[PDB]
Design a protein around this ligand. Structure first.
Ligand code: SF4
Ligand SMILES: [Zn+2]
Length: 888
């Protein structure tokens, strides 16, 4: 039985069937001092207590958080729901389909593979910026999206009918996290007579954005999301919780982008890897939900697991503003107050006992950008001309392009649209208002529109060759932009709506005009992309921009007008208004009270109702797609998009006792913070690449290749794209090249091809890496890929959260150097042969010895963090375990 059933009571005498687990009735004083994020974990456990998967001791361990956060103990977490996007959605539905096949083959019931909790899939990663600057670019971009992606869309639509509790938001709707904030989020579930907190895991590293609204949720890899969808609790070490105290008032010209950029730099310097961040202080109450979500969004960019903003009165008002039903609205607040998860940020006696406390004074926040190559390299707007000019002559790296001093004023004239332009170092060639990070915030969006209005009024313009775009996260933004009369002014400056999806933010930035590309490559120019996203690593925005800066939407427009980032806005005018002479950025920048006025009068409940009323049925191309009535998928042999994966090939019911890895070669010797885009690229498939050869052999031409993202349903392509990033720094070669050495023969080969040589001779493989291995995106192909390449272990100094879990879920051992030890300190060259002794009895985070062919040995920490993770390893992976659990 549930040993906590005596806690269940009516929330309201008048609607008596609707109960909740009243946590205050624990009569435990520890509860009221808990961080609010831990309180949600506590509720999830209490409601789910059965004594098999969620035990009574687990509840006691969570209540005792204050002590047990230091005892490295594991706790179950069952989230209320799952959210997916299309890039991770396809491979997730392919593995569900493959699990059905596998269950059936063991004589089980294929119907047991079905989501038991609600799952939402938003299709937002497919559309690209092919056309811009016109009223018709939206239709033309959506048309192209459908033509390119028809087969994957047919497969996803199939999935939504073949699996229970799968809702699809079709293409053209918006971006996963924005749609989540505005529409999908419940905040409080009302389910089978029970109220409980909304909480979630998403297959996207930025799922943390929902934490701004007070829903506990974070990114997991696809295989973890599948386990969760099948009823399996996440197993996690009980986290420490950093309290982040916000104080004072931000300056009236400060955007929420300035704040998040400041917080990123700061939290990256405190180091919060493996930890929860909870916000509190007087400052939080002044921040709108949109502002909170922006801070919570960039959570993976500063390394925290979650960035939680407890539900308060600002949250309630956001729910009424976005047109949540008044029926729901009554019990949402009333429940949170009764259970003790309703916050008052202006009450210091309500503050939890945090692990420790880091502060930020909001008046110290200045207008700023991040770049040119990392999200944490925050640079003030006042200092942008000086910083970029320093970057020009500086040693190549995160803050250098080392262009020779005599070449600092290189430029190239070009002809676009029959007129002559000049391009120089620092010239803006992409100016994109993208990203759910900022388009969910009417303050920066209307701020940008009012800046545009005042700029057109002052006679300013954006030169026609600049790739300017607006990619809103929902139809709601287009609606209020038009309603406020601000849209025609954004149109004029080249910021017509180009589509609803990730687009520039994820790297789907489209082509640049050919004369512009020839100017950049001819004069070796450092061309600049300015964007309102959260990621600016030197691969990911556009192949032709060497510098990319994160900036608030109004700054995006300002730099587009300027045409360059080599400007000192306070000293040099943007243009001359014939009449009233010189016009500075100061003169056209709107304050937070002109914006707030426009926001109160145009961002209204009726607008959200109309946009989301028809959300699922409005797409006529989607509605028209034919899908089979099948419950088991008919794998088409002709398909280059959907392929039955090899993972569960020859799966047995009985467990295999895991063997030592004997004499492995090092396939790759990698450095610090190798990202999941290096391990598993999502964009362009290069002409000289193994994936390109596989595709050419199936009759495809380069323009049909599509992205690596779109092919995540085809393991053959995805394996060939593993470590296929053109900027991969393999320390075997000491240059940027997606290649390695096949050590027995000495030949340099593309990484897939070297792996195949090793595999065919039956040789096991490992990877060596430095700090923060696997940073960024959540893609589980960063673990499946290496698994199919024959990689049995990784040895790194540290791992990022999601990636480590994905390695474990694929049966790869994540090994870690003992603190103070690494490849240089142990004298590893990467040329030795590695034996990893896996003992008969395993323990979380145990030390194992590593023997070398040279006779040398050392120790590494085996990074299975909990007992259930050890079980996943014993089973050869998380899904193999789930198949077995379902089969019997
Ligand atoms: S790629 Fe950008 S726009 Fe898309 S979900 Fe991620 S953060 Fe949001
Ligand atoms: Zn010249």
């Amino acid at each position: 039985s549930n040993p906590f059933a005596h806690l269940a009571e009516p929330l309201d005498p008048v609607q008596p069937g609707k109960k909740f687990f009243n946590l205050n009735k624990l009569e435990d004083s520890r509860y009221g001092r808990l961080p609010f994020s831990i309180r949600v974990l506590l509720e999830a456990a209490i409601r789910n207590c059965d004594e098999f998967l969620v035990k009574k001791q687990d509840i006691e361990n969570i209540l005792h958080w204050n002590v047990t956060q230091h005892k490295n103990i594991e706790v179950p977490f069952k989230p209320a729901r799952v959210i997916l996007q299309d890039f991770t959605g396809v491979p997730a539905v392919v593995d569900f389909a493959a699990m059905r096949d596998a269950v059936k083959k063991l004589g089980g019931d294929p119907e047991k593979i079905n989501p038991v909790c609600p799952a939402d899939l938003v299709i937002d990663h497919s559309i690209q910026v092919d056309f811009n600057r016109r009223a018709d670019s939206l239709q033309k971009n959506q048309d192209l999206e459908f033509e390119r992606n028809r087969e994957r869309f047919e497969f996803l639509k199939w999935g939504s009918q073949a699996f229970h509790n799968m809702r699809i938001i079709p293409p053209g709707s918006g971006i996963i996290h924005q749609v989540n904030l505005e529409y999908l989020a419940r905040v409080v579930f009302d389910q089978d007579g029970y109220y409980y907190p909304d909480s979630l895991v998403g297959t996207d590293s930025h799922t943390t954005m929902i934490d701004g609204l007070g829903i506990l949720g974070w990114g997991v890899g696809g295989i973890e999301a599948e386990a969760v969808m099948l009823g399996q609790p996440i197993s996690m070490v009980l986290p420490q919780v950093i309290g982040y105290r916000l104080m004072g008032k931000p300056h009236p010209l400060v955007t929420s982008t300035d704040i998040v950029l400041t917080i990123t730099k700061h939290l990256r310097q405190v180091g919060v890897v493996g930890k929860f961040v909870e916000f509190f202080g007087p400052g939080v109450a002044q921040l709108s939900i949109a502002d909170r979500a922006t801070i919570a969004n960039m959570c993976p960019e500063y390394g925290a697991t979650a960035a939680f903003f407890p539900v308060d009165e600002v949250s309630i008002t956001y729910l009424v503003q976005t047109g949540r039903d008044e029926e729901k609205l009554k019990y949402i607040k009333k429940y949170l107050q009764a259970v003790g998860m309703f916050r008052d940020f202006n009450d210091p006696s309500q503050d939890p006992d945090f692990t420790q406390v880091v502060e930020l004074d909001l008046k110290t926040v200045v207008p700023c950008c991040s770049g040119p190559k990392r999200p944490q390299d925050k640079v003030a707007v006042s200092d942008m001309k000086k910083d970029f000019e320093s970057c020009l002559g500086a040693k190549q790296g995160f803050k250098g392009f080392q262009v020779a001093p005599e070449h600092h004023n290189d430029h190239k004239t070009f002809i676009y649209d029959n007129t002559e332009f000049t391009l120089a170092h620092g010239s803006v060639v992409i100016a994109a208002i993208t990203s759910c990070t900022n388009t969910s915030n009417p303050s920066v969006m209307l701020g940008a529109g009012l800046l545009a209005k005042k700029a057109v009024d002052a006679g300013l313009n954006v030169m026609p060759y600049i790739k300017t775009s607006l990619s809103p996260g929902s139809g709601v933004v287009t609606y209020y932009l038009q309603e406020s009369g601000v849209m025609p002014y954004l149109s004029q400056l080249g910021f017509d709506v180009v589509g609803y999806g990730c687009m520039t933010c994820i790297g789907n930035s489209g082509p640049l005009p050919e004369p512009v590309v020839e100017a950049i490559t001819q004069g070796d120019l450092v061309a600049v992309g300015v964007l309102s996203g959260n990621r600016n690593f030197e691969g990911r925005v556009h192949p032709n921009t060497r510098a990319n800066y994160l900036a608030s939407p109004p700054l995006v427009i300002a730099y587009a007008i300027a045409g360059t980032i080599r400007i000192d806005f306070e000293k040099e005018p943007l243009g001359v208004n014939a009449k009233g002479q010189q016009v500075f950025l100061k003169d056209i920048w709107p304050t937070r009270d002109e914006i707030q006025a426009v926001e109160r009068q145009y961002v209204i409940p009726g607008m959200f109702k109309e946009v989301y009323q028809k959300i699922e049925t409005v797409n006529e191309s989607w509605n028209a797609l034919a899908t089979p009535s099948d419950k088991l998928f008919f794998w088409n042999s002709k398909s280059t998009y959907i392929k039955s994966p090899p993972f569960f090939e020859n799966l047995t019911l009985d467990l295999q006792p895991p063997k030592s890895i004997v004499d492995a070669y090092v396939l790759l010797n990698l450095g610090d913070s190798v990202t999941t885009d290096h391990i598993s690229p999502a964009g362009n498939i290069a002409r000289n690449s193994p994936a390109a050869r596989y595709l050419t052999n199936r009759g495809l031409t380069p323009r049909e290749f599509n992205s690596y993202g779109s092919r995540r349903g085809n393991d053959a392509v995805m394996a060939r794209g593993t470590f296929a990033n053109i900027r991969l720094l393999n320390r075997f070669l000491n240059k940027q090249a997606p290649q390695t050495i096949h050590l027995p023969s000495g030949e340099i080969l593309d990484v897939f091809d070297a792996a195949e040589r090793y595999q065919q001779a039956g040789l096991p493989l490992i990877v060596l890496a430095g700090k923060e291995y696997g940073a960024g995106s959540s893609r589980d192909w960063a673990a499946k890929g290496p698994f199919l390449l024959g990689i049995k272990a990784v040895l790194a100094e540290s791992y990022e959260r999601i990636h480590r879990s994905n390695l474990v879920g694929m049966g790869v051992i994540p090994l870690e150097y003992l603190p103070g030890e690494n490849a240089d300190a142990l004298g590893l060259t990467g040329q030795e042969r590695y034996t990893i002794i896996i003992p008969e009895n395993l323990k979380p985070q145990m030390k194992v010895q590593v023997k070398l062919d040279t006779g040398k040995t050392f120790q590494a920490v085996m990074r299975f963090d909990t007992d259930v993770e050890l079980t996943y390893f014993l089973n050869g992976g998380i899904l193999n375990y789930m198949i077995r659990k379902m089969a019997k």
